[PDB]
Paper text:
The retinoblastoma tumor suppressor (Rb) is a multifunctional protein that primarily regulates the cell cycle but also has roles in cellular differentiation, DNA damage response, and apoptosis. Essential functions of Rb occur through its pocket domain, which is necessary for regulating binding interactions with E2F transcription factors and transcription repressors that bind via an LxCxE motif. The pocket domain is the most highly conserved region of the multidomain protein, as well as the most frequent site of mutations. Protein X-ray crystallography of four missense variants reveals how mutations destabilize the protein fold and inhibit E2FTD or LxCxE binding.
For a structural example of E7LxCxE inhibition, S751Y was crystallized. This variant weakens both E2F1TD and E7LxCxE binding relative to WT but causes the greatest reduction to E7LxCxE binding of all 75 missense variants tested here. The biggest reduction in E7LxCxE binding occurs for S751Y, which weakens the RbP–E7LxCxE binding interaction relative to WT by approximately 26-fold at 25 °C and 35-fold at 37 °C. The structure of S751Y reveals that the tyrosine sidechain of the mutant sits within a hydrophobic-binding pocket used for LxCxE binding. Specifically, the tyrosine sits in a position to compete for the binding of a conserved I or L, which constitutes a significant part of the LxCxEx(I/L)-binding epitope. Even though the variant tyrosine creates a snug fit into the pocket used for I/L binding, this variant is not stabilizing; instead, it causes a large destabilizing effect (ΔTm = −5.4 ± 0.5 °C). In the structure of WT Rb-E7LxCxE, the S751 sidechain helps to stabilize the N-terminus of an alpha helix through an ST motif–stabilizing H-bond to the amide at i+3. Loss of this known helix-stabilizing motif may be responsible for the large thermostability decrease seen for S751Y.
Residue numbers in the entry: 383 to 437, 440 to 499, 512 to 576, 600 to 611, 642 to 784
Write the structure that this text describes.
């Protein structure tokens, strides 16, 4: 409530100190930014009411998002003023996706505060999950007054993107994989040089996925504490080189298939039900991630089907190496 107070007692328009930043720009963004806000209010209020029904509360919801947005932007620009050139500073304040993403993050903070949850706001504004992800950490770092709970909600939005949404078909993420650390750096990347967006994203994916396997292996593989490290390499080599297997799927599905897979090739019998059972106890686990996965185009099925009919058909050649006289070398633990 400490933040919602300044938002409820603050102005509807950009501050004088923020107007300075606008005045220090080669191309001045003042008019592009506000018209952008005005236009977007309309798509937000329409799509809002068409979800709760009739009575218009959305206008008040949007106006607080707009106040948070202008506040967070000012805070963000104050550090980017030393980091960015005169020309990068202006390329940023004129970049639309950066702005959409920032405003979307403001709007989600209020929506979630007033518990249509994420990822509603992305589709409302037609914003790709991978673009929105680029703003979150710097958004947190730029709003000192976020509640513990608000921070925690945003980090959960970040993690849903990394686990599934950025892997949806049409995600620019795949463009970036084929082509081959702040929000402003990541939005200033030119469309077409090693990409900072993909590299940070992957450094964080690996750290997240591994935290989830490590919990899952301590409970179920106390008898094979050496197997944990062997499983991560299959998981990591999968994500790096066989990335297509995540298209429209969930990080946790590739995890579970790997730990079952290695224990099969090591002649360690542990059936899928014993792990799918252990997986549910994870904080935000949901049973459909293992109850319905993709087998064939526009087809859904149980998880063991995916393991037998999708996972091995690409990776059978790579897995048997794990038991030969020449087993593949183990992957570095993400720091």
């Amino acid at each position: 409530q400490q933040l919602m107070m300044i938002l409820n007692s603050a102005s509807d328009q950009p501050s004088e100190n923020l107007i300075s930043y606008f005045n220090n720009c080669t191309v001045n963004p003042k008019e592009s930014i506000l018209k952008r806000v005005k236009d977007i209010g309309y798509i937000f209020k329409e799509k809002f009411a068409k979800a709760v029904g009739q009575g218009e509360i959305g206008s008040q919801r949007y106006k607080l998002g707009v106040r948070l947005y202008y506040r967070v932007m000012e805070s963000m620009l104050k550090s980017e003023e030393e980091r960015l050139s005169i020309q990068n500073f202006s390329k940023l304040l004129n970049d639309n996706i950066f702005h959409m993403s920032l405003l979307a993050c403001a709007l989600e903070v209020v929506m979630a505060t007033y518990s249509l949850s994420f990822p509603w706001i992305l589709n409302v504004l037609n914003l790709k999950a991978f673009d929105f992800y680029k703003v979150i950490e710097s958004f947190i770092k730029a709003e000192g007054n976020l509640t513990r709970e608000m921070i925690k909600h945003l980090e959960r939005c970040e993690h849903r993107i990394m686990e599934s949404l950025a892997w949806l078909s049409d995600s620019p993420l795949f463009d970036l994989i084929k082509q081959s650390h702040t929000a402003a750096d990541m939005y200033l990347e030119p469309v077409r040089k090693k990409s900072t967006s993909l590299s940070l994203f992957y450094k964080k994916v690996y750290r997240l996925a591994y935290l989830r396997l490590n919990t899952l292996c301590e409970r179920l593989l106390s008898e094979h504490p050496e197997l944990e490290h062997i499983i991560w390499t299959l998981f990591q080599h999968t994500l790096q080189n066989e990335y297509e297997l995540m298209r429209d799927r969930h990080l946790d599905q590739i995890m579970m298939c790997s730990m079952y897979g290695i224990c099969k090739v090591k002649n360690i019998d542990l059936k899928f039900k014993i792990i799918v059972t252990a997986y549910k106890d994870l904080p935000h686990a949901v049973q459909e991630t293992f109850k319905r996965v993709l087998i064939k185009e526009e087809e859904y099925d149980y998880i063991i089907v995916f393991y037998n009919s999708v996972f091995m058909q690409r990776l059978k050649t790579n897995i048997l190496q794990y038991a030969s006289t020449r087993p593949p070398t183990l992957a570095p633990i993400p720091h």
